[PDB]
Amino acid sequence: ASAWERFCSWITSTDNRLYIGWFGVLMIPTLLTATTVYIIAFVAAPPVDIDGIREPVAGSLLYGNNIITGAVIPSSASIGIHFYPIWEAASLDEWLYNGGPYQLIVDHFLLGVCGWIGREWEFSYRLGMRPWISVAFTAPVAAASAVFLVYPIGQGSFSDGMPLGISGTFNFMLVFQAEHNILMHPFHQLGVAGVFGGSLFSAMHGSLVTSSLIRETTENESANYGYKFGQEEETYNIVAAHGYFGRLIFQYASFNNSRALHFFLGLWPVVGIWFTALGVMTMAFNLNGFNFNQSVVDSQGRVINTWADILNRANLGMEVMHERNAHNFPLDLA
Amino acid sequence: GRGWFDLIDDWLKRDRFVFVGWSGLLLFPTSYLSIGGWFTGTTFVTSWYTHGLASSYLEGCNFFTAAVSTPANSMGHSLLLLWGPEAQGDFTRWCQIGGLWAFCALHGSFALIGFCLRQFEIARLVGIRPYNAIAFSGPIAIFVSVFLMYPLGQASWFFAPSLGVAAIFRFLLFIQGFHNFTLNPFHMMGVAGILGAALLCAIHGATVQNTIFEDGDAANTFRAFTPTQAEETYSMVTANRFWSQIFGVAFSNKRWLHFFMLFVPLAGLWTSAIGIVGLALNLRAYDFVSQELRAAEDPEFETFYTKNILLNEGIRSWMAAQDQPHENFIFPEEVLPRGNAL
Amino acid sequence: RPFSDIITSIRYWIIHSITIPALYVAGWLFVSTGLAYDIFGTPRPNEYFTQDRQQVPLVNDRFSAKQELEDLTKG
Amino acid sequence: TDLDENTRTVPLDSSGTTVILTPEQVKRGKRLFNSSCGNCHVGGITKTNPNLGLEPDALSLATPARDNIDALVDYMKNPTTYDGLESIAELHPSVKSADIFPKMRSLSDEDLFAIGGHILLQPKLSSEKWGGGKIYY
Amino acid sequence: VAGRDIESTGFAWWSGNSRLINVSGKLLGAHVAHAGLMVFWCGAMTLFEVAHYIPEKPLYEQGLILLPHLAVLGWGVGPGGEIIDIYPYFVVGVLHLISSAVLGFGGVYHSLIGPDTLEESFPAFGYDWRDKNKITTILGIHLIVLGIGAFLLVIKAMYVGGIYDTWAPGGGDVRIIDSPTLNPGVIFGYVLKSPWGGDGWIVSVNNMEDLVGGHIWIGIICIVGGFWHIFTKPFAWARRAYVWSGEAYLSYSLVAVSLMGFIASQYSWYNNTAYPSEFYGPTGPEASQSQAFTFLVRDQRLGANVSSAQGPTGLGKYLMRSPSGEIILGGETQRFWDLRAPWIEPLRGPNGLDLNKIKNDIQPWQERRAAEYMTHAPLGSLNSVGGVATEINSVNYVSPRSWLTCAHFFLGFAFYIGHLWHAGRARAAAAGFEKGINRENEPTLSLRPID
Amino acid sequence: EGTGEALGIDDTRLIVPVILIPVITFILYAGFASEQDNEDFFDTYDQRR
Ligand code: CLA
Ligand code: CLA
Ligand code: CLA
Ligand code: CLA
Ligand code: CLA
Ligand code: CLA
Ligand SMILES: CC1=CCCC(C)(C)[C@H]1/C=C/C(C)=C/C=C/C(C)=C/C=C/C=C(C)/C=C/C=C(C)/C=C/C1=C(C)CCCC1(C)C
Ligand SMILES: CC1=CCCC(C)(C)[C@H]1/C=C/C(C)=C/C=C/C(C)=C/C=C/C=C(C)/C=C/C=C(C)/C=C/C1=C(C)CCCC1(C)C
Ligand SMILES: CC1=CCCC(C)(C)[C@H]1/C=C/C(C)=C/C=C/C(C)=C/C=C/C=C(C)/C=C/C=C(C)/C=C\C1=C(C)CCCC1(C)C
Ligand code: OEX
Ligand SMILES: [Cl-]
Ligand SMILES: [Fe+2]
């Protein structure tokens, strides 16, 4: 019976098509700002001097890019990780020259995905359900913060964050491998295990649930219509799938419990992506992957190459060719 | 049951700890001969005479740098039979020319065939639909396209993925440097399928574990499920409401959800298989010609694509000498593509 | 019978106090004897290079591969 | 091949006399090199001044020539510029400047001998790796 | 078995400690035993560092992370940050190790044989998670203890020996901080500074007077707040804004401690005052600026005019202007132009690096420091191969800064995840649907359909 | 940038919104708060609004 109470009821209303809530109060403006500035900068933005050497790089469609090559270029290396809003620039043109839109988009987007985590918790709470779906979403947000924020902080420049494009993403990958050897770093290997196992278990679980669907459908009708939304009964025989998978490998391997099965499904990719996000966070501060170069030497003591050395050759080619005009000294300490 | 074929069929399909089946006559030998072969090749056999590398724990390698390296490039696409004209029955020379890679790969292809046949057989005998055998077609396509058709399109088995960890990393960077496979739209579709499948796995696990019905009074809710219950253990309606009002859309049909969970990774693998089959013939989405011409005529036009092309040139030039020793590439420091300083 | 029922049985361990270490040591003498280097052709730490063979050995023909392998591995 | 004496024989003095390093000597030399100077001289290069590496060509063309054990050992106590006209003991690790370079304090004459033996032994192992840099990693 | 099995508690063995929430005495034993674990590790690890410490190398090159803390506090270190004696380190280690025995005995006692719940035999110590006043009194007692710890650091810096000031006149040295800055505009000026480049928030402490004065402020704040909470109860605005259960309090502590982990990681990465570069090694910015300084000195010595030398792109190869105009070292060190270290400030004028000092008056010790900090950059592998990722296996080295920063960033993120888990569970359990959705009264079925 | 102003407030104008908008929001929140039953409770959370 007070204006603030009515406002809080509307914000926390489960009747809006899209739930807002208090985390949505912070998410919607931030995400909308990030979307608007990203669209405007991707379709039309002047070239950005990413490396701080007065060599602008084009990332916008109007300046001769396609959807694959387009990007919002990272900030200038001259800026570093100084805060660079529009009002800290002498003009908007020189704000765009040094890649300020990247800072704007990244900050607003990171705040928005944090709000998305909180909003997922919130609408879990409003519906009387368990929390922790948000915990599952922390892993992508962890990786996004690792690449967009933590890697600039460790390396000391927003030029080092991943570009907001497709080809720029590949560039960031290749430079990261050249400088840190992420492939040999075990956290990235755990992430590869996480995504590959997520695909494996997704295919397996979908295959076994679809394979043991209870007959509730005629032959001239899609099997999916055998399930009615909100029904009380199970739509497939858990016993049949469990027995088939037990015969496939061995009985003990199969998850006879469905809740444990789904916990494992939620656990494997989330933990894998947590580990790889943490690996990128640690290589931000230059704790690199393994370096087995010249680890095998003969009795005389001359190096017999291994696959690590041949990988090192590719890393070295990428290292020498990346940012050809930016380095004046032999070591890539920055 | 009386006939000899009926007796063999009855024994093979017996319900024991390890189901054998008729497919087991193809799976268990070859699969075994594959895995032990890897464990042999990664433990005692060298790549000194094929790649110039050490690739065994005996030579000093670890789990990362140990691999069953591909055959020598001079072997071409030989089947590398131990009785063939290359080894001529000599086990030592056979292992030295990298014929153990041919052993492992050719036995692994038939092991995959036998395992898919096993999936079909067990699905038939149990009496369910054969959707798991068709989802393993994705991995079969990956193996066939990447380990068989790619080297068969190239000069030799030498350019196949050497069976290892660091070997596979070298294959990744080699394919990127020489084909620019990240720019390949089929690879993009494949990584989309893989990451979307991991996403579906994570969201489905979290949603099911977090819309569970209260079927007990224990804080630990795993024991509150019975395998044979004819009641759904979690609320589809509540999950639908959550994802509809959080994300705008949400699954309303379990069967559609679980077919989608199947389709995404399988579609990704088949799409990426198309791209690797393209890469076998050097039919590569290497370049965008418009930007190459513009950068040729405009020396101030720079994009992240052009930086990736320069990185690929660096990979190729700085990797070819040690990665393809049979070519005898001597690139002086003058011709190696470099940058200022480093 | 169930796995744990076998593992805790004393007979299991009367068998595998002797069987398992036997082959665990058999592998030890397999490699310590230098027999692996001879079966599998793997160079020892003092066999990657030799006189006139300070470069990497490579087989450059499919059909004479055995011939040049002996020629290179004459030692 | 083994670590034969042909690999382990290195020039001792400027006239041309040689000395056969022992396996203990080369082991200690490798450890001492990696511990005391590897940070700048990993791979036979000079990180702080790459114009002057430890490859035998640079050492031979130094004034005095540093392609022998006695000359190297003298450099480790009386370091000089590449032309041997200015003392750089205040900018280079030397046993006579170990208070400002605390890694050279524990080295004895045999340690300096072993380090020089390691330096002269390296170019024998590889044709271009010692002092070659990135191009031969 | 009662209270220690799933049947009587509803918690599995892997959520076993969740069976300690309402068992106050056993939970006290858990905490005290784990504190014993902490002090045990401190004593054992610093004794391990003392045993493995060789007097030749510096601390940062030997993989030593704990002895730097004692050296910063002013024990066994002389001028220039040279560790002269390591007996006080041994004393600290043995004291922590011996105290661990007492704390472990107390924890094991209260866990095993002590009273299960303290709320009937020791009402002074017993509590209920929902009793706000008692929990606030406990919080206030702990706040007073924290203030006493801050004042202990103050006493060490002011009276008992003093702390190591790396910014001291001459070389860095152990000195008494006689005049800490007690001005609120400085101490809380740091707290309200931005975290971005050049500002650094509280990581940007460039002198020990600010550190010690703000520790005085923290001590006063904590003691006043503890006495406030002992004699007060949460206000109505707070009483409706929090979940008053043990798991909620745990989640609050988890988020706070995660924030502290992140802040400490960046303290070790960027600060070189509370973490002097002569104990923890160079910062990344320090190493990069040192590379630029070394090659500036080399090329100037070889005849180049560094101020007028043009790089490939038209910018300065050695010296250029920062975006605000300050004369700064060139190349990729331009991003690290905010570095301020005691070895490079000597050449710094009001408008940046003074060109006259840079040309005529670079001392040999600055070149030595720059070379050392260049060759000892934070770069390294997990197996501790120093240098870039494409280096060879000859140098065994990862900076302590990298280890500390990576470890504490990892633990900060992990404890944020723990906060999210425990805060969500606290809310769900307080509302009473942490076990599942009630099939009888499902909220969604009562809601009107959308669309 | 990099000047060290508290909350980035270089102009004194910036403070007027920063202090007043919370105060208007606080005033609106006080009408809600004053309507609540502000006595203590012994529960994990307050079920009275
Ligand atoms: C499931 C069983 C199985 C399968 C499918 C394969 C499959 C394979 N093995 Mg074999 N292999 C097996 C079991 C199996 N193996 C076992 C148990 C061993 C351990 C003893 C081996 C040991 C082994 C080695 C050592 C090698 C292979 C290799 C091969 C490949 C070549 C096959 C070939 O051409 O052989 C020849 C053809 C046949 C065996 C088919 C015989 C067909 C009929 C029965 C013959 C009838 C005779 C006829 C009447 C004669 C009249 C005279 C004339 C006029 C015709 C292929 C991938 C090679 C390889 O991988 O190279 C890289 C290789 O070198 N295998
Ligand atoms: C920091 C680590 C830590 C600590 C301090 C504790 C502490 C505790 N746990 Mg445990 N716990 C831990 C980790 C820890 N846990 C982990 C990792 C798990 C997962 C496996 C569990 C799983 C778990 C379960 C399932 C349960 C507990 C319980 C308990 C409490 C009662 C113990 C009891 O009566 O057991 C009796 C144990 C024994 C008789 C075995 C002997 C243990 C000895 C004392 C250890 C020796 C220590 C040391 C060497 C002695 C030094 C002596 C000194 C004088 C020098 C106790 C407060 C119980 C509880 O909540 O009760 C209400 C309970 O049910 N915990
Ligand atoms: C978190 C810490 C903690 C807490 C809250 C408690 C709480 C409790 N313990 Mg204790 N206990 C602890 C740690 C703790 N213990 C430790 C570390 C040990 C191992 C030594 C014990 C061993 C222990 C036993 C053996 C018993 C208890 C018991 C008790 C209860 C009665 C306390 C009492 O009568 O105090 C009275 C207080 C004193 C006698 C202390 C007087 C002060 C002396 C002189 C020290 C002065 C120190 C000085 C001020 C420090 C200067 C600091 C400077 C360096 C800066 C109570 C529930 C009893 C119980 O539960 O019985 C069933 C019991 O029998 N505890
Ligand atoms: C461990 C520390 C601790 C804890 C857990 C608590 C807990 C509590 N205090 Mg607090 N309090 C503490 C120390 C602590 N106090 C100290 C040392 C003092 C100083 C004397 C106070 C003074 C105090 C008063 C006067 C009151 C409380 C009250 C409360 C309650 C409400 C807290 C709240 O909503 O904050 C809300 C916090 C804010 C709205 C923001 C804080 C403002 C600062 C200046 C922010 C500055 C920005 C910051 C640097 C940004 C980056 C931080 C980064 C780490 C993320 C709660 C029981 C209330 C109560 O009911 O008391 C009976 C109350 O009125 N406390
Ligand atoms: C495996 C577990 C583990 C380990 C081994 C360590 C180890 C360490 N942590 Mg910790 N840490 C951990 C987990 C762990 N952490 C976790 C999970 C978190 C949460 C994310 C943190 C968060 C954290 C922070 C925030 C910090 C550390 C830091 C440290 C280091 C110093 C420890 C210290 O003194 O703390 C502090 C010790 C105490 C609070 C105990 C009381 C201290 C008293 C009051 C001191 C009295 C001093 C006085 C001068 C003495 C003389 C008095 C008189 C004679 C005058 C050390 C390397 C520090 C560091 O260097 O970070 C880079 C740091 O700042 N850690
Ligand atoms: C201040 C620290 C703190 C405290 C006091 C507690 C206390 C508690 N937690 Mg824990 N928790 C913490 C930090 C803490 N947590 C953090 C940082 C996380 C996030 C990773 C979690 C995540 C967590 C979960 C998911 C759960 C608990 C639960 C519990 C309860 C039982 C735990 C138990 O018995 O474990 C016994 C110990 C073991 C079984 C040993 C497990 C050791 C693991 C496998 C090693 C670490 C693996 C891997 C490296 C972790 C990656 C993490 C990732 C985010 C980077 C108990 C109230 C459980 C509960 O019932 O809550 C009410 C529960 O479900 N906690
Ligand atoms: C190769 C070949 C050539 C021609 C004809 C022939 C039939 C002989 C054919 C086939 C040969 C065959 C099949 C040989 C069989 C060899 C086999 C099966 C070898 C396999 C060996 C297995 C090994 C090491 C396993 C090692 C496991 C390790 C460390 C595990 C690590 C672990 C440990 C130790 C403790 C806990 C953690 C973890 C990670 C689980
Ligand atoms: C005097 C001297 C001179 C030269 C150096 C030297 C080191 C030798 C030194 C000697 C030092 C000595 C002897 C130090 C003695 C220290 C001792 C004995 C420390 C012991 C500390 C005890 C601790 C942590 C106990 C903690 C126990 C805990 C949580 C137990 C946990 C558990 C509990 C409580 C219940 C469930 C089971 C579980 C989880 C295991
Ligand atoms: C000690 C030292 C060393 C180096 C020099 C230096 C000057 C820095 C000196 C001094 C340092 C000083 C004075 C540091 C002090 C730090 C301070 C005061 C930090 C403040 C932290 C406060 C925080 C997070 C407050 C967050 C509170 C929250 C969400 C409360 C809860 C809630 C609110 C308010 C509304 C929404 C609902 C919810 C979530 C229930
Ligand atoms: O910019 Mn992006 O990037 Ca990370 O490193 Mn140094 O700086 Mn550049 O180099 Mn390699
Ligand atoms: Cl540079
Ligand atoms: Fe399901």
Residue numbers in the entry:
A (entry chain a): 11 to 344
B (entry chain d): 10 to 351
C (entry chain e): 9 to 83
D (entry chain v): 27 to 163
E (entry chain c): 23 to 473
F (entry chain w): 43 to 91
Which text from the study accompanies this structure?
Here, we report the structure of a PSII–ACPII supercomplex from the cryptophyte Chroomonas placoidea by cryo-electron microscopy (cryo-EM). The structure of PSII–ACPII was resolved by cryo-EM single-particle analysis, achieving an overall resolution of 2.53 Å. Each PSII monomer comprises a PSII core complex, 6 ACPIIs, and a Chl a-binding polypeptide, denoted as Psb-γ. From the N-terminus to the C-terminus, Psb-γ encompasses the N-terminal region, the transmembrane domain, the ACPIIs-binding motif and the core-binding motif, establishing a connection between the entire core and ACPII. Psb-γ has a single transmembrane (TM) α-helix (A82-A108) that extends into the interface between the core, ACPII-2, and ACPII-4. The unoccupied area on the stromal surface of PSII enables Psb-γ to bind to PSII, which is important for stabilizing the PSII–ACPII association. ACPII-1/2/3 and ACPII-4/5/6 antennae form two belts of linear trimers on one side of the PSII core, and the ACPII-1/2/3 assemblies are positioned on the outer side of ACPII-4/5/6.
An essential protein complex in oxygenic photosynthesis is Photosystem II (PSII), a multi-subunit pigment–protein complex embedded in thylakoid membranes. PSII is instrumental in catalyzing light-induced water-splitting reactions, which result in the generation of electrons, protons, and molecular oxygen. The core of PSII is associated with peripheral light-harvesting antennae to enhance the absorption cross-section of PSII. The membrane-embedded LHCs of cryptophytes contain Chl a/c2 and alloxanthins, thereby designated alloxanthin Chl a/c-binding proteins (ACPs).
